[PDB]
Structures are given as structure tokens and as C-alpha cells.
Amino acid sequence: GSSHHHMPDNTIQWDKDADGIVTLTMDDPSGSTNVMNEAYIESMGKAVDRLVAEKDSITGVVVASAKKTFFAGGDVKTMIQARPEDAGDVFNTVETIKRQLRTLETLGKPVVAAINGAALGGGLEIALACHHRIAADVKGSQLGLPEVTLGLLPGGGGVTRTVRMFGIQNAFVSVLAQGTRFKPAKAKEIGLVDELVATVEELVPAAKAWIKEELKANPDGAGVQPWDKKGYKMPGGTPSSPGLAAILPSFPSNLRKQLKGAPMPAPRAILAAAVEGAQVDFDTASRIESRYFASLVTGQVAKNMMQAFFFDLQAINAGGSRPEGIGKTPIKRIGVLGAGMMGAGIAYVSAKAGYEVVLKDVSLEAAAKGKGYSEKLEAKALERGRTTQERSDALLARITPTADAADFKGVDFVIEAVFENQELKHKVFGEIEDIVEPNAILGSNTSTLPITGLATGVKRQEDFIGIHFFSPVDKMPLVEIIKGEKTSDEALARVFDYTLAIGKTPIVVNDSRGFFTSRVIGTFVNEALAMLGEGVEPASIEQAGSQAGYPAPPLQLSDELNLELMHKIAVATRKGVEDAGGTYQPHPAEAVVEKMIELGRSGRLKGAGFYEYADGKRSGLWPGLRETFKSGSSQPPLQDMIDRMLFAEALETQKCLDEGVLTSTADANIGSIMGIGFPPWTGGSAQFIVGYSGPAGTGKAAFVARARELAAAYGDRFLPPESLLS
Amino acid sequence: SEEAFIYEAIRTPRGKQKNGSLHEVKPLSLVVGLIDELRKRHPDLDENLISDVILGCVSPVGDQGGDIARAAVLASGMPVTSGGVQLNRFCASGLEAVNTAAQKVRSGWDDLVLAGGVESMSRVPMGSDGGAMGLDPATNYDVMFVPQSIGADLIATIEGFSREDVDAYALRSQQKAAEAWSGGYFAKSVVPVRDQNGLLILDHDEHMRPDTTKEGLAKLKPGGFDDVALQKYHWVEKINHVHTGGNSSGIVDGAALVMIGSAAAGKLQGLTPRARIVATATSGADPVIMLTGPTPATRKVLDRAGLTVDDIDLFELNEAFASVVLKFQKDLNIPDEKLNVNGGAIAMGHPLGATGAMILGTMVDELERRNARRALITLCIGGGMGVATIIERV
Amino acid sequence: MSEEAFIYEAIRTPRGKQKNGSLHEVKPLSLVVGLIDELRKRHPDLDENLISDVILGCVSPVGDQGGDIARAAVLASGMPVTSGGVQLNRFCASGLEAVNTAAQKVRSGWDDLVLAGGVESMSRVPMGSDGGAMGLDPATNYDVMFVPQSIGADLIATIEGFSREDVDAYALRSQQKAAEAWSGGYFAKSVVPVRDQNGLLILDHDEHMRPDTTKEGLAKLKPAGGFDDVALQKYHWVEKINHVHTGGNSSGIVDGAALVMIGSAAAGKLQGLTPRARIVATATSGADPVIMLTGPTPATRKVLDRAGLTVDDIDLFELNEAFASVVLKFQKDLNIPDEKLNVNGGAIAMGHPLGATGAMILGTMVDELERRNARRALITLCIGGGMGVATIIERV
Ligand SMILES: Nc1ccc2cc(S(=O)(=O)Nc3ccc4cc(S(=O)(=O)O)cc(O)c4c3)cc(O)c2c1
Ligand SMILES: Nc1ccc2cc(S(=O)(=O)O)cc(O)c2c1
């Protein structure tokens, strides 16, 4: 009937001291972390039932954990399998979970959360059910509700209680909408945590001491949350309040402004559950939250985002592409060649990780201006207060700018960021390859030049490897590791471990012109340029890019990548295949590139492109663009433009998997999202195929029909490869 | 079957928003004064034939809540058998009350009906009733809620209306409203508002600025709604914001009454029919741009009555925004001398619930003055709707 | 009076109770959208562009029910943007008034197909949320002699001489006839169960009913600011008001919505729709606003004079069970037979969703006329402020 329960193993340990304080120690024996699994639901149901039974002999409850992490989310393995027909079970599961927490909450006696480590998602939802939260200010301790980042929403009372605690606007912006994780100090600052302790050993004693003092100082209000008292007033007011009702119609429009119209239903569902929940009582609000939760879990976007940002991202971090058996080799001195934006950013993220960096350029003045990129970055970090002056000085002190090739003495890790000329890169490596250590990694930050050709410029080709970064290096989280033919597996592992060391996500790519990121992002740019040549309005092309979910619209990106760079990229791919006796595959976007080069509008670096630029600031599209390409003469559906750019990247990704360029779909999904900004709601350019949804249906079969639908209308380049076909 | 005739059409002066003369007057008192004026003009009227009172009100809360129509029937001492119903179709609530009244008379089940609206925006501001399109995030995200002002600026951008274009129209409305007042056109219809002691409170449209100059309008000044509008209208790069407080409709208080009945009802009461409701129509357009509803509604009511633009002597569109009227004039190729000939809401104001009934009576008088035959009245509506009515002078 | 108005569909939601009701978590906009999607399921090939207006009754158009909830329903349900959408308020008869206006719009010839109905989520937007001049303005409250409906209902029982056992005997019959109707499956194809965004069931029955009601239980209930003095100042010949009305013999506070599809013969024939009933006549009248609830009797006589009919010509009488004495007075005035009056129960058992009531009891009579294979039915409601509305339908 209406129970605390939904074979499994016990997860909670029971302990009632002489004062009547029961200590519920969550300790899942089937893993290293407490997770809202079927074992927890049964274990918490047993403990809560015993709390109701022994209520006459219990004076307080303390919820603690025996793991290094308090409690980190739920069984994502289970929620990703929830089909639309399983919405009833999903609803009953979260209703049972919140029924247990609601009983623990309304127990008539204080309950304190002893947060020892990370309390994330469902874990923070357990602490929020308690009346008092004490956190241990320790390393790596995080608190937050990152449900939205998996296409879900806080369904275990997270949305209902954070709204009751901070109001609609504060709870949405600060905690719910972006799933922000907080350190224990910041968690106490915003109200998520009530007080802090230095070590984990003081937690449980302080929790029982607070219960001892709360019963003595507040006998009436003990074990009663603020929203359960008489005369509770929600901060900021309810939607019926005259103040909130004036600004409330601007919340969904602002959210659509942030999402840029991208089909992400999770933030919208959070704002709906937050507002609709504030209009009714707590229990009814909680049931509304359950229905929106079951709506997302059974939806396809959540399955895409759960696949990418939970399973795929863990499979990468677990060394899925790291060679087996290879051990760890420390990195003592990093030598960066070139002090451009790339080389300076490389030198920053390396020194930020604690490495000693020797930033070499042609001149001491150039190498000094490169270190200034880290100084102006530490300036903003010290201004907004993200780091201390103590460690900001130690960070810059690890960067040693130089112009002498002898200062690469003792370097066991070389990253090159000079301009992309083959003979140039061969000269730069030749004058340092004998100064550095004999086991030094020789890395290149090329974006198109094949690694096997660059490897001939050194004698230790087995240690030559491609280390492709993305600007700005201080913010872009992906590193494309390219494996040449001679690149050993040890060099692959050391660069793999280096990428994780600087706090970035690696993908391993076999050598091929264009690699994976540059090759796939070309199809995205080329589809837009095609559409412009076909006569589509330039504003519609940019809108189609933003509404697809991309961070930057394509024509705007086509100005940062420079059309002269795009021109010689197409000339190089043509010349290479032509020398092999074949017939190059020309793309219709090439005609639009050459037309813009002729008009003297080659991109942002020139100062004029598809947009007009003033004092280095973009200021609207070029008015002569419409007359040049007869804009308005072709008016296809916006969803066709959106699908033309998404499918182009999705089909090119499938080619890279067929050609062995990628070795795992996890590298393709994370590599597309974090490398070239593929929309996160898709779950990646590889997940988009199996997770496609439209009028043709859902799944790989619908993607194929829609690909053939686009192929008939816009060209056979949208024909699905043989692997996708049954 | 039956034919609907307008026997009377009066209205109150429109009191401005800031320091308005009608701010102290309850909206119920505005309607009761117009009811007493109808008794003054026809003391022989057997009010037992008045079968319903249909009032339009956009914010039916507070002073305007609890079926203000029924309150007006009881408070004014009308027979208890005279019904009383409040409706709401946003800006065209006044004209919808008239249309419904005419439709009830045509149905043969109603003999004599009072219709009109009331809106005391200084006491009950717009949006006070709440709403699901705005306050519910699940549906605000779906219907792409955008304020009417942005949809008006979007129209000016798409149609190529400059800042001088919308301001030149705003100057025209100010001049034609002053010309109509100084010409005594509004003498019979504008019923001055008085207190319980008979002392004068307001006898003119306070929102009018007849000393407006083109230079003064150019010195006027125009939360993510622009991005929401451009997400649907993806071919337009940027919205040119041209509308200011001088080229948009004013926020004013007021009320209007229209006595509609069958021929038999008017003959039995000795009433002289002034105009005949020829046809009405309700249509709509995209709710993001919102204010493009009048064009299909006007087109629909013209085909229903078997009439064309050439057969209409006077066009009366509510001047919610200057671009909405210029867009309407551009679409149907309306002559300049036929469009809002006595000024509009830009000069005199826009009392939401009562505007449809105000411009309706404004055309009844102007049809009799010019001795013209037909007039078409239409309004743009929030949510993308549109209402149009064709009257013929009898 | 040219075009004939026909009822093609008449559906409603189950009526969820006020205290811990199943529908308290459902927004009233969602209740209306649910009925729109049901009409789409029953007629998938219906060209919705023919639908020219959506008229919804709503007595408290505030909060969730403000901002033209009909237009919100048109936009949210994805109906054609040219389908209008207007909210009207005529107190308790707003639901029937929307149907009457929809039928009158069809008769005028300027509208072809109209959705009419009402919605009232009283557990979310309680009565009086809109304020009101007759109540909250002292100059008007003093003049109109404002008295709540319940006191006027007690006054009717005092004047006509209905005892506490009289009003409770009717309440028992309403609970019994409503339970018999549900058990017989009379409401099977008309009550559309409410579901959430996941398809999970929320409510599929009128949960305000108490089918185990007894005469003994009703007699134990207690009856429900000087309003008694105000009513007797006008009815000066009455000494003291006998308060006989309790929560058992009065209408219930419930949430719910109803939808009726009304159109011309050309509109239904073009869409392949089968007309279920025809609007014969409507009428609006009223009586004293202090007793308030004597409005149905003149409105019923007026609609019978307009259609050229008498009491004997009507097969089923359906009056909203606002209060038991109101129905007993209406039965006493016109000599209504017992076996013709509220044969499937009424608001005492199933509830009174203010904006949706008129459209609900209308759809009840369209179904009962077909089941009994009868011809005519007369639907009427008492209204606050002393008004009345009646309508006569005929099975086609
Ligand atoms: N000791 C630790 C403990 C946890 C660590 C997690 C990450 S992670 O952010 O990469 N993984 C994620 C990703 C999504 C999550 C969603 C939810 S949910 O509840 O919203 O479903 C809950 C989670 O815990 C999630 C964790 C990184 C670490 O270093 C960690 C270290
Ligand atoms: N014009 C109509 C319409 C409906 C009718 C129904 C019946 S019945 O309910 O006895 O079957 C009898 C009639 O004569 C009817 C005549």
C-alpha cells in the first residue's frame, strides 16, 4: 500500500547510545560510495520503520557515512534503462524515497547530517531532509545537486526543499539550474550547510552535541523544519505574492535566452516544478516534483546526457583509451616551444598543475609576453578572489621564460606550439631534441598536419606524439592525443596521464589528416557556408546554429577560423588525394570561401568577414552579404538547417569510427562536446545517432530515415554509411 | 434572422494614469454613470426588456471583480431580470461584448442588451489578474510569451517603418483628436464624470497632448524577450525598437456603453436605430508578434458581409502601437483619409476593457456626421487574436 | 435565429474534492487541455481551423485562472491560432452561459464551430479570490443588501416550509441516484479520467460522492456577520430564519472542467460529426438578489414560453443542486414530477465546480436523453446576485 519499501543487502548500520540518539551510518558493502540503489531504499526503509516503532525511546538521529564520500547520487545504471512504459515504476521509486525522508523529517525530534565527504545529488537530498547539517572542511568535499547536468532534476526532495529554503529565484539560479557543486565553505555561505568542523572525527560528536543543545534551548521547535512551522514565509514570496508575480513572467524568457532555444527540457522542468511546487503544500509540491522527474528520466535527452556525462566520461577517466599494462612515469620539467596564445595557455595549465615550465620562444621579449598571459590570468583570479597571493606567486614562479635552447636542459616533456609549417616544426624540434632528456616526450600542437610526417624530423620517433589543445587553453577541457604510426604505447600513456594531471579530458586519435575535431568541425562550418551559397538568410543560419545547441553560430565561428586557413586546408586535402591518383571530393562550401577571399573578407583577423568588426568587437552581419549571395532566395525549414548541421557532424563521426580514427564511441561523444562544442543534449555526435528523435521516430532507424530524408533534399553527402544500416 | 441595431453608444472621458482625474472614481461608478445617462436620454425606456448587460474587463480583480456587470445592474437599480455578465478577450473585450450582444439579438433569444466595457487601469493595473501564459513556466516556455511592445517593434522592423514613420503617425493622431474635440464631434457621446454631489470630475480626454511636435516625439526614449522573438522570426537580424510613450497607446481609465436590440425591441420602446451591425468576425495570427490579428479578422468580416475595402467609408483600428496601424494600412491599402479620422489611443488613451466599445461608438457618430454608409472597426489583441466588426448607418 | 445549433460532443473531468483532493495538484489550464486532447482522440480528422472560438466560464479568473484561460488553452493545446478564446463570468451559470453564447454565436451565422465549457479549480483558486464590488465596497454592499447564498437558501426553506428532514431527504436521494448512475455506467463515455504528463492516472470518478449516506448521518450534521438581520429587513413578514442547510444537503466544493462542442449543421456535416442534441432555446431572467436563489423559476418559464413548450413537454429536468431547498422550491413552483428531476444525482453528491457546472449538467442530460431514448431536457441553474439561466435541448 503506502509503505517505506519498494533479496538486497543491508546498507545502514544502527546505533542508539545511552542518550537515545540513533546514529544511522550509511555503508553500502557493494561499493566504495553510498548510492541511492535498491539496497539503500530497502535499508533506509527498515531504519525509518524502526525509528517510528522506537519513537518513544529515541531523542535524536544522526545520519553519517562510513565512506570517503557522504553520499553521491543514485543508480544511474537503473534510471538510464527506464523506458516510457516504466514511468509508473520511476514515479513510485522516488515517491518511496521521499516518503522515507519525509518521515525522518517530521519525526518530532532533531536529525543532524554529519557530512564527511561529497554529498552530491541524492546525497545532498538526504542532508536537506535533516534539520541541521554539519560539514567537515576537508579536501575534495563537494555539495550540490548536479542532476540537471545529466538531463535529470533533483527528484528526491531537492527541488522542493531548496525552494522552501531559499525561494524560487535563489534556489533555481544558485543550485538547481546549473547543478553547481560547492566546497564546504561556500556551502555554508549560501545556506546549504549550517556549520563546519575541521576534521571528520569532530562531526559525530558535534552532531550529538547540537542535538543535546537544541533539545535544551529549543524544545518546541526541535525536529521541525521552517516550512512546517506555523506562519512560514517563503523567501522572495510565492507566485501569488505581488512582488514575485511581477518578475515571474521573465523567468522562462530569461531561461530561453540562456538556452538559446536549444532543446534541453531539464532546466525548463526544474523551473516548472519549482514554481508549481511553491503554489501548494509541501507534500503536494513533492508529488509534482516526482512527476516531472519521471518525465525526464523516461525522456531521450536524459538518456543522451546520462550516457555522455556519466558513463562515457567515467569510461574515459578510467583509462579506457589508455594502453594496458603501462606504468606511471613522472613529469619533472615541461618545455613549451612558442609563446603564442596556445603556448602561453599550455604553459599556464601546466604550471597551474604544479609543473615546472620552461617557456621558450624566438626572443626573450616574446617568451616574456607569453608568461604575461598567465600574469593577467592570475590578476583576474586574485581580483575576483579565486586564489591566494601565496600560491599565485608560486604558480608564476614555475614559468621560466627564455630564448636560449640550452634552457631545455632537464626537460622530459616537450610541447610545441609554433605555427603550422612542416619544415618549421622540423627545425624547432631539431634544435632541442638533443638538449632535453633522452626519454622526453616530443609533443606537437598541430591541428591538420599528420603526426607521422612531423615525426621524421626527430630521431626518437617513438616518443613523438600529437598533443592537440584548444584555445583558450585555460578553459577548453579537451586534449586530442594523436598517435602517429611510430608513436609507442608508453608515450601514449604518459601524455594520457599528463592530460589528467592538468585537469583535462583526453581522447586518443589515430593519425589521419584532420584528426577528429578539426575534420568534424569542418563539416559543421561547411554546411553553413553551403546554405549561405544556396541563398539562405545569414540570420537564419546563425539562429539555426544557436538553436541546435552550439555555443557559437557557424558563420561567426567561420570568422575566427579564418577563411584563408580554410582555403589552404581544402587545397591541402585536394593535393594529397590527387597525388594518390584519385579524384578529390569537393564540397559546395568552397565556392563561398573563395568568393569571400576575393571580396577581401577573409575573417576576423583581417577585420572583415561575414560580420563587420569595429575596434576588435563584432558588430552585426555585413550588409553586403545578402546582395552577394542572393539571401532570401532559398527558405528551407529551420529544423532542416538545424538537422543539416547536426547530421553532417554525426555522419562524419560515424566515418571516423569506421576508419579507425576513433577507438570508442565514448571518445567520440566527449570529444565532440568538449572539443568542438557539439550540443550537450545530444549526448555527443555518436550518441546523436542512436538517440535521435523526430517525426520519423526515435533511435538508429529514425536517424537513418531522416538522414535519407536530408540526402534527397540537400545532397548525397547526408546518405548514412553502411555501418548504421542493418 | 433578426437584425442587430445600435440605438445608443456613449462613453466616459479617458482619465490619464499619473495624477488622473478618474483615479478616485471606482470602475463600478463609471459604468453606473453611463447607465444613468441612458435613462436621461430615454426616460420612457422600459428596462424590463433589457435582458442582459455584457461588460468587457481585462483585469477582473479587486474593484473589477465579482461580475462587475451584475454589480452595475444592481447598483444602478436596473431590474434584477437584466442579467449581467463579464467577459475578457484582452484588448477587444469591449468590441467582443458588443459582438456577443449583437449575436444574442440575432439568435432571437434576446431583445435588448447593454454592451460595453470598463477599465480603471490606474486602480487595477494590467496583469493584476495573473495568468497562465505569463506566470506558469511550463506554458510561458511553450507559447513563447513576448510583450506586445516587442511585437510592435518587430512589425516596424520587418515592414521597414522608421522612427520618423511611427512618430509622424503619432503626430497625426494627436492632431486629428484635437480637431475632433474642437469640432465638437464628441459632444454627444462623451458623458462627463461627476461625483455624488454633482461636482465635475472629468469632461475631456486628459491623455491628449495636442501641442505635440515632430521634434518632441524624436526626443523620446524607446529581459531577453528580444531573443525569444528572434528565435521564431529567425530571418530578421535585430529588432529596431522605434515605439516610445508618444507613439504607443496610453494607459487610461474609462468606460463605454452600447445599447443593442432588435428592430421590434427598438420600435416597442420608441428608440431610433442609429446603425446596424452588418457582420462580425474573430480570427488571429502568430502570438509572438501578437498584433497582426486585425488583418485576417478584417479580411474575414469583409468576405462574410460580401464587402470589399472599397465599400467601407471609415476604418477604425485601435492605435495600440503606431506600427500596428501602419502595417494594417499597408496590407489592405487603406486610404489615409479613411483611417482613424478622429484620432486614436495614441492621443486619447486605451482603456483595455472599454476600448472596443469606445471606438465602436466613435464610428457611429462619425458615420452620422459625414452622412457616410459603412464603417469597419477592428482591434489587435494579446495572444495573437483579432476581432473586426462592420456597422452600417441606418 | 437562422442557423440551428447542435451539440456534437460534451465531455467533462471527474470532480475532485476540496480536502486532499486528487486534482489539487493539477493546474486548471491542464484540466481544460486534457479535455481538448480527448476531443482530438474521438475525432482525429477534425479540421480544427473550423473552430472559430473557445468560450470558457470561470467565476474566479485570478491566479491560475486569469489571463484568458481559454486563449491559454488554445495556445497550450496547440489549437489553431485563429480559434479565439474568451473567458466569461456569470457566477454559478458561467458554464451554461458559455454554451448558450456559443449556441447563440452559431445561430447568428457568424460562427461555425465553437468549443464551450468551463473550469474551476476551487481547491487552488477558492471562491472570492477575485474580490468584488458587491461585497468589498461598502456603498454597494449597503445598497444591494448583500447576503450569502446559504442564508438565502435557508430563507427559501423557511418561507416554503421545508424541514431539516425535507432537505436531508433530497440530499439522500441525490447521493443514491448518483451512485446508481455510476454503478450503471451512465457516465462511462463522458467522464474523462485525468492523467499526468506521464500517463499515470490521477482521478477517474467523482470523489466527492458519499454513496453510504444515511438519514441518520445527515441529521447529525450541524448547520452552516448579521446577514440574518439583513435578509429579514427585506422579508419583514418572516420572523426568524430556519437554518436547515448543512454540508450534506448543499453542493460540494470541487475541482473540474467541462467541454462542449457546438456547431451548425454545415459545420458538423462537413467534419463527419454526428449531432447528439440540438439547442432549442435559452433564456436569462432573475429574481430578488437577497433571496438570490429564486432565479431558476422565472428563467425556466421564460425559456418554455420562448420555445412554445410546457412542463409536460420536457422529459428530464436538471437543476443545479446548489442547495436542497432551491431544488424543492423549483419542484414546488412548477409541479415538477419526482421521477424527472435530477435523475442521475447532482452537485450535492458529485460537487459544484463553479465555472464548469453549467456545462457538466448539460452534458449529463445529452447522455441521459440518449440512454432513456427521450426527447427534451431542460437545464437550469440558480445564480448569485439573483439571476437565472435556463436552456432546452432536444435529442437528435
Ligand atoms: N570522491 C568523489 C566523488 C564523486 C566524484 C564525482 C566526480 S564527477 O563529477 O566526474 N562525476 C559525477 C557526475 C554526475 C553526477 C550526478 C549525480 S546525481 O545525483 O545528480 O545523479 C551525482 C554525482 O555524484 C555525480 C558525479 C568527480 C570526482 O572527482 C568525484 C570524487
Ligand atoms: N423533431 C424530433 C426530434 C426528436 C424526437 C425524438 C422522439 S423520441 O425521443 O420519442 O424518440 C420523438 C420525436 O417525435 C422527435 C421529433
Coordinates of C-alpha atoms in Angstrom, one line a residue, chain A residues 389-681:
Chain A
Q389 CA 48.6 35.7 -3.3
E390 CA 50.7 32.9 -1.8
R391 CA 50.0 30.3 -4.5
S392 CA 49.5 32.8 -7.3
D393 CA 53.2 33.8 -6.9
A394 CA 54.3 30.2 -6.8
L395 CA 52.3 29.5 -10.0
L396 CA 54.0 32.2 -12.0
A397 CA 57.4 31.4 -10.4
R398 CA 57.2 27.9 -12.1
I399 CA 57.1 29.5 -15.6
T400 CA 60.6 30.4 -16.7
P401 CA 60.6 32.4 -20.0
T402 CA 63.6 32.1 -22.1
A403 CA 65.0 32.4 -25.6
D404 CA 68.0 30.0 -25.2
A405 CA 67.7 26.4 -26.4
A406 CA 70.1 25.3 -23.6
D407 CA 67.4 26.1 -21.0
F408 CA 65.6 23.0 -22.2
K409 CA 68.1 21.0 -20.2
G410 CA 66.3 18.6 -17.9
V411 CA 63.0 18.8 -19.8
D412 CA 61.3 15.4 -20.0
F413 CA 58.1 16.7 -21.7
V414 CA 58.2 18.9 -24.8
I415 CA 55.1 20.6 -26.2
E416 CA 55.4 22.6 -29.5
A417 CA 53.0 25.4 -30.4
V418 CA 54.8 27.1 -33.3
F419 CA 52.9 28.0 -36.5
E420 CA 51.8 25.1 -38.8
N421 CA 54.6 24.8 -41.3
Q422 CA 56.2 21.3 -41.6
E423 CA 59.8 22.5 -42.2
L424 CA 59.4 25.0 -39.3
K425 CA 58.3 22.3 -36.9
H426 CA 61.2 20.1 -38.0
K427 CA 63.7 22.9 -37.4
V428 CA 62.3 23.8 -33.9
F429 CA 62.4 20.1 -32.8
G430 CA 65.9 19.5 -34.2
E431 CA 67.4 22.2 -32.0
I432 CA 66.1 20.9 -28.7
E433 CA 65.8 17.2 -29.2
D434 CA 69.4 16.7 -28.0
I435 CA 69.2 19.2 -25.1
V436 CA 66.2 17.6 -23.5
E437 CA 66.2 14.3 -21.6
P438 CA 66.7 11.0 -23.5
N439 CA 63.2 9.9 -22.5
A440 CA 61.5 13.2 -23.1
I441 CA 58.1 13.3 -24.7
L442 CA 58.1 15.3 -28.0
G443 CA 54.6 16.6 -28.4
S444 CA 53.2 18.8 -31.2
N445 CA 50.1 21.0 -31.1
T446 CA 49.3 20.7 -34.8
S447 CA 45.7 20.8 -35.9
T448 CA 45.9 19.4 -39.5
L449 CA 49.5 18.3 -40.2
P450 CA 49.8 14.5 -39.9
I451 CA 51.9 13.4 -37.0
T452 CA 53.7 10.7 -38.9
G453 CA 55.2 13.3 -41.2
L454 CA 56.3 15.5 -38.4
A455 CA 57.8 12.6 -36.5
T456 CA 60.5 12.2 -39.2
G457 CA 62.1 15.5 -38.0
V458 CA 63.3 13.8 -34.8
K459 CA 65.5 10.8 -34.2
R460 CA 63.4 9.3 -31.3
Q461 CA 60.2 9.0 -33.3
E462 CA 58.7 6.5 -30.8
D463 CA 58.4 9.4 -28.3
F464 CA 56.9 11.8 -30.9
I465 CA 53.2 12.3 -30.3
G466 CA 50.4 14.8 -31.1
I467 CA 49.1 16.8 -28.2
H468 CA 46.3 19.0 -29.6
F469 CA 44.9 21.7 -27.4
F470 CA 42.1 24.1 -27.9
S471 CA 42.1 27.9 -27.3
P472 CA 41.6 29.3 -24.8
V473 CA 43.7 26.5 -23.2
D474 CA 42.9 27.7 -19.7
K475 CA 39.2 26.9 -20.3
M476 CA 38.9 24.3 -23.0
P477 CA 38.7 20.9 -21.3
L478 CA 39.7 18.5 -24.1
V479 CA 43.2 17.4 -25.3
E480 CA 43.2 15.5 -28.6
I481 CA 46.1 13.0 -28.3
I482 CA 47.1 11.9 -31.8
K483 CA 49.0 8.6 -32.2
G484 CA 51.4 8.5 -35.1
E485 CA 52.5 5.2 -36.7
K486 CA 55.8 5.2 -34.8
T487 CA 54.3 6.6 -31.5
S488 CA 54.8 3.9 -28.8
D489 CA 52.2 3.0 -26.2
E490 CA 54.3 4.3 -23.4
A491 CA 54.4 7.8 -24.9
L492 CA 50.6 7.5 -25.3
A493 CA 50.2 6.7 -21.6
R494 CA 52.5 9.4 -20.4
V495 CA 50.6 12.0 -22.4
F496 CA 47.4 10.5 -21.2
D497 CA 48.5 10.9 -17.6
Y498 CA 49.7 14.4 -18.3
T499 CA 46.2 15.4 -19.6
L500 CA 44.5 14.2 -16.5
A501 CA 47.2 15.9 -14.4
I502 CA 46.4 19.3 -15.8
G503 CA 42.8 18.6 -15.1
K504 CA 41.6 18.0 -18.7
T505 CA 39.9 15.1 -20.5
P506 CA 41.9 13.1 -23.1
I507 CA 40.8 11.3 -26.2
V508 CA 43.2 9.0 -28.2
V509 CA 43.0 9.5 -32.0
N510 CA 44.9 7.6 -34.7
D511 CA 46.9 9.6 -37.2
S512 CA 44.8 11.0 -40.1
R513 CA 44.6 14.4 -41.9
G514 CA 42.1 16.4 -40.0
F515 CA 42.3 14.1 -36.9
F516 CA 38.7 14.0 -35.4
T517 CA 38.0 17.5 -34.0
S518 CA 39.2 19.6 -37.0
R519 CA 37.7 17.2 -39.5
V520 CA 34.3 17.0 -37.9
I521 CA 34.1 20.8 -37.2
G522 CA 34.8 21.4 -40.8
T523 CA 31.6 19.7 -41.9
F524 CA 29.7 21.9 -39.5
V525 CA 31.2 25.1 -40.9
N526 CA 30.9 23.8 -44.5
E527 CA 27.2 23.1 -44.1
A528 CA 26.5 26.7 -43.1
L529 CA 28.6 28.1 -45.8
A530 CA 26.8 25.8 -48.2
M531 CA 23.4 27.1 -47.0
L532 CA 24.7 30.7 -47.5
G533 CA 25.7 29.9 -51.0
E534 CA 22.3 28.3 -51.6
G535 CA 20.7 31.7 -50.8
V536 CA 19.6 31.1 -47.2
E537 CA 19.4 34.2 -45.0
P538 CA 22.5 34.7 -42.9
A539 CA 20.5 35.5 -39.8
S540 CA 18.6 32.2 -40.2
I541 CA 21.9 30.2 -40.5
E542 CA 23.2 31.8 -37.2
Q543 CA 19.9 31.2 -35.5
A544 CA 19.8 27.6 -36.6
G545 CA 23.3 27.1 -35.1
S546 CA 22.4 28.6 -31.7
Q547 CA 19.0 26.7 -31.6
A548 CA 20.7 23.5 -32.5
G549 CA 22.7 23.9 -29.2
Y550 CA 26.0 25.1 -30.5
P551 CA 28.0 27.6 -28.4
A552 CA 28.9 29.8 -31.3
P553 CA 26.9 30.3 -34.5
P554 CA 28.7 28.8 -37.6
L555 CA 29.3 32.0 -39.7
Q556 CA 30.7 33.7 -36.6
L557 CA 33.0 30.7 -36.0
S558 CA 33.9 30.8 -39.7
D559 CA 35.4 34.2 -39.0
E560 CA 37.6 33.0 -36.1
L561 CA 38.9 30.1 -38.1
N562 CA 39.9 32.4 -40.9
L563 CA 38.7 31.6 -44.5
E564 CA 42.3 31.7 -45.8
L565 CA 43.1 28.9 -43.3
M566 CA 40.0 27.1 -44.6
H567 CA 41.2 27.7 -48.2
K568 CA 44.6 26.1 -47.8
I569 CA 43.1 23.3 -45.7
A570 CA 40.9 22.4 -48.7
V571 CA 43.8 22.8 -51.1
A572 CA 46.0 20.5 -49.0
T573 CA 43.3 17.7 -48.8
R574 CA 42.8 18.0 -52.6
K575 CA 46.5 18.0 -53.4
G576 CA 47.2 15.0 -51.1
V577 CA 44.4 12.8 -52.6
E578 CA 45.1 13.9 -56.1
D579 CA 48.8 12.8 -55.9
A580 CA 47.4 9.4 -54.8
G581 CA 45.8 9.1 -58.3
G582 CA 42.2 9.6 -57.0
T583 CA 39.5 12.2 -57.5
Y584 CA 39.0 14.6 -54.6
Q585 CA 35.5 15.1 -53.2
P586 CA 34.8 18.8 -53.5
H587 CA 32.4 20.5 -51.0
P588 CA 30.0 23.2 -52.2
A589 CA 31.1 25.5 -49.3
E590 CA 34.5 26.0 -51.1
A591 CA 32.9 28.3 -53.6
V592 CA 31.6 30.5 -50.8
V593 CA 35.0 30.6 -49.2
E594 CA 36.8 31.8 -52.4
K595 CA 34.0 34.4 -53.0
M596 CA 34.7 35.9 -49.6
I597 CA 38.5 35.9 -50.1
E598 CA 38.1 37.7 -53.4
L599 CA 36.0 40.4 -51.7
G600 CA 38.7 40.9 -49.1
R601 CA 36.6 39.5 -46.3
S602 CA 38.7 36.5 -45.0
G603 CA 37.7 36.5 -41.4
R604 CA 38.1 38.3 -38.1
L605 CA 41.9 38.5 -38.3
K606 CA 41.6 40.6 -41.5
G607 CA 38.9 42.7 -39.7
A608 CA 36.1 41.9 -42.1
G609 CA 34.2 38.7 -42.8
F610 CA 30.6 37.5 -42.6
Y611 CA 30.4 40.1 -39.8
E612 CA 31.6 43.6 -39.6
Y613 CA 34.2 44.2 -36.9
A614 CA 34.9 47.5 -35.2
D615 CA 37.7 48.1 -32.7
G616 CA 38.1 44.3 -32.4
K617 CA 34.4 43.9 -31.4
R618 CA 31.9 42.1 -33.6
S619 CA 29.0 44.4 -34.7
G620 CA 26.4 42.6 -36.8
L621 CA 26.5 40.8 -40.1
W622 CA 28.0 42.5 -43.2
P623 CA 25.1 44.2 -45.0
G624 CA 26.6 43.4 -48.5
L625 CA 26.3 39.7 -47.6
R626 CA 22.7 39.5 -48.7
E627 CA 23.2 41.0 -52.1
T628 CA 26.3 38.9 -52.7
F629 CA 24.7 35.5 -52.2
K630 CA 21.1 36.5 -53.0
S631 CA 20.0 35.9 -49.4
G632 CA 16.3 35.1 -49.1
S633 CA 16.0 33.2 -52.4
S634 CA 16.0 29.9 -50.6
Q635 CA 13.9 29.4 -47.5
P636 CA 14.1 25.9 -46.1
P637 CA 12.6 24.9 -42.7
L638 CA 14.7 26.0 -39.7
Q639 CA 14.7 22.4 -38.4
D640 CA 16.2 21.4 -41.8
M641 CA 19.0 23.8 -41.3
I642 CA 19.5 22.6 -37.7
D643 CA 19.4 19.0 -38.8
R644 CA 21.8 19.7 -41.8
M645 CA 24.5 20.9 -39.4
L646 CA 23.9 18.2 -36.7
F647 CA 23.7 15.3 -39.1
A648 CA 26.8 16.4 -41.0
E649 CA 28.9 16.1 -37.9
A650 CA 27.0 12.9 -36.8
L651 CA 27.7 11.2 -40.1
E652 CA 31.3 12.3 -40.2
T653 CA 31.8 11.0 -36.7
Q654 CA 30.5 7.6 -37.8
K655 CA 33.1 7.6 -40.6
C656 CA 35.9 8.3 -38.1
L657 CA 34.7 5.3 -36.1
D658 CA 34.6 3.1 -39.3
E659 CA 38.0 4.3 -40.4
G660 CA 39.6 3.6 -37.0
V661 CA 40.2 7.3 -36.4
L662 CA 38.4 6.7 -33.1
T663 CA 38.6 3.6 -31.0
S664 CA 35.5 4.1 -28.8
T665 CA 32.2 6.0 -29.0
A666 CA 32.9 7.4 -25.6
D667 CA 35.9 9.3 -27.1
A668 CA 33.6 10.5 -30.0
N669 CA 30.8 11.8 -27.7
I670 CA 33.1 13.5 -25.1
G671 CA 35.5 14.6 -27.9
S672 CA 32.7 16.3 -29.8
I673 CA 31.1 18.0 -26.8
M674 CA 34.3 19.3 -25.2
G675 CA 36.4 19.6 -28.3
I676 CA 34.2 21.3 -30.9
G677 CA 31.2 22.3 -28.8
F678 CA 28.7 19.7 -30.0
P679 CA 25.3 20.3 -28.2
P680 CA 25.2 18.5 -24.8
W681 CA 21.6 17.5 -25.1

